[PDB]
């Protein structure tokens, strides 16, 4: 079970059951960030201290797409479904087969919609989705 070097050919992302396909160029095409800081240190006037840990386990992910990708059509249909008043979960999941690093979330929602720029060359379309519960997977292959 040799440790495969990194490659985007071996990363898979699944949005509502379908694959994510037409991604923009760059080192940051799918990025997930936790919602808050894990904890806070409180130091008093005497030198004693107290740590406090949060119970909030939430995250956002940002997906950068090309103007010609089926995932853009899927996300723009989901946006219109939300605008109509139909509010459901739509899971998102992605993982790397080389290291088993990734995470899952069983209920996501659209948070930001992209800007439609036409101009002279084609440009990015950035979507943002948010969940209330994100559990990272343990990389068991280091």
């Amino acid at each position: 079970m040799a440790m495969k070097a990194y490659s985007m050919l071996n990363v898979t992302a699944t949005l509502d059951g379908r694959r994510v396909i037409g991604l923009m160029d760059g080192d940051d095409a799918i990025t997930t960030s936790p919602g808050v800081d894990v904890g806070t240190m409180l130091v008093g006037a005497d030198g004693s201290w107290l740590f406090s840990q949060t119970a909030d386990k939430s995250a956002t992910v940002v997906i950068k797409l090309k103007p010609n990708s089926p995932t853009h059509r899927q996300l723009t249909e989901k946006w219109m479904a939300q605008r109509a008043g139909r509010l459901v979960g739509f899971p998102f999941d992605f993982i790397d087969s080389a290291s088993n690093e990734g995470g899952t979330g069983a209920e996501f929602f659209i948070q930001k919609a992209p800007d439609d720029s036409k101009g002279n060359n084609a440009v990015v379309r950035e979507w943002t989705i948010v969940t209330g519960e994100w559990t990272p997977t343990i990389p068991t292959l280091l």
Binding site: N10, T12, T14, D16, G17, R18, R19, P91, D93, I95, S97, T104, G105, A106, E133, T135, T137, I138, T140
Partner: protein, 382 residues
């Protein structure tokens, strides 16, 4: 002039109506009675919508109506009971032979697979041919429950009764022992069990151990409630010193179910119900994955796409309270609650690749139980 019924329709009846509260499952009521208008060889099973709309089965027959009576009598109600035609012949042409009963059981799946909990009621009770059901529901994704109306389970020594000749060997069957003339499996199962929604947070009814049915009566005794239910005071539940069953005792002014519907020495009903919800939910999500995509390819990307389903189901289950909280129960040190390992199609030969049968994905568990018995010490010092 004209009535107001020209533009509206307002009525009034004298009945009791409770909210619907959909849930998980359905139960099966198998007997030998046939109604000739709705089961007459055309429907080995038949579905319904509500009890009131029952006309085919007489509102006085002991089998169907008196059992659906306690099936539909919970405060929130289930829907669509699966009515019977199954073993219409009496057990077997040679009565003592269980082969005919086994074949009858094996010929009622071929019409319908929508029932999960199997209940015989008001008849077939204490028959020797019933051993086929106990042997058969093993390796069969269902739950088998038998409520006696009378037997000798109150002797902690005898070995002829249902719960004695099968005790400690079966992990998917249970006994609702009681006195005469009460349908009991229907009272709690499929009436409280059914309307359990595991899609919400903290919806783990791990016990099923102190729960009140709609209307019923208690049995009697104190040292007879331990021959039945085989429950010792503080030790736990011992197999040699009793026979497991459920009797609906009363302690204060309240009446409630007791022993929490065990199956064998320390196996409870909610474990089976919750794990079966997990399995049935993974099935539904897998099917919903095969209908959305154009295809699922036979590559590693396809294996990860398939394995994305148990990952979501496990996060759903850990939220309800079925899966444990990521800590070693022995020492309290960190330990993963669940893992998911995806196989490789790579070294699976093309000789096997052409099968269009994917390799198996393996998942890991840890159960989170609950409390049945409490202790308080109270030292006094004056």
């Amino acid at each position: 002039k004209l009535p107001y019924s020209r533009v509206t329709n307002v009525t009034l009846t004298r009945t009791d109506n409770f909210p619907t509260r959909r849930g998980f499952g359905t139960q099966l009521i198998l007997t030998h009675t046939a109604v000739s208008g709705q089961v007459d060889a055309t429907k080995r099973t038949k579905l319904y919508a509500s009890l009131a709309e029952v006309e085919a089965d007489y509102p006085a027959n002991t089998s169907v109506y008196k059992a659906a009576l306690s099936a539909f009598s919970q405060n929130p109600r289930p829907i669509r009971l699966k009515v019977g035609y199954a073993a219409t012949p009496t057990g077997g042409d040679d009565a003592a032979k269980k082969a005919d009963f086994i074949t009858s059981l094996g010929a009622i799946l071929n019409y319908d697979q929508a029932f999960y909990q199997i209940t015989l009621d008001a008849a077939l009770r204490d028959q020797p041919y019933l051993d086929g059901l106990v042997e058969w529901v093993e390796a069969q994704p269902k739950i088998a429950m038998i409520d006696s109306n009378a037997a000798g389970h109150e002797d902690p020594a005898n070995t002829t009764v249902i719960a004695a000749r099968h005790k400690g060997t079966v992990e998917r069957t249970a006994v609702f022992y009681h006195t005469d003339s009460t349908e009991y499996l229907a009272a709690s199962m499929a009436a409280y069990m059914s309307t359990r929604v595991f899609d919400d947070a903290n919806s783990a009814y791990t016990l099923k151990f102190k729960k009140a049915p709609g209307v019923r009566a208690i049995d009697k005794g104190s040292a007879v409630v331990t021959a039945i239910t085989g429950f010792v005071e503080q030790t736990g539940q011992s197999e040699s010193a009793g026979h497991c069953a459920n009797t609906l005792i009363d302690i204060g002014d309240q009446e409630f179910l007791v022993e929490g519907s065990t199956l064998t020495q320390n196996v409870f009903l909610d474990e089976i119900h919750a794990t079966d919800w997990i399995i049935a939910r993974t099935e539904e999500e897998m099917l919903s994955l095969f209908l959305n995509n154009d295809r699922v390819p036979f590559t590693d990307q396809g294996m990860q796409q398939l394995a994305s389903v148990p990952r979501a189901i496990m996060q759903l289950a850990a939220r309800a309270g079925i899966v444990a909280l990521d800590l070693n129960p022995l020492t309290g040190a960190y330990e993963p609650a669940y893992t998911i390992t995806v196989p490789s199609v790579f070294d699976i030969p093309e000789s096997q690749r052409k099968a269009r049968i994917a390799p198996a994905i393996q998942v890991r568990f840890r159960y989170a139980g609950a409390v049945h018995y409490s202790v308080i010490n109270y030292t006094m010092t004056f």
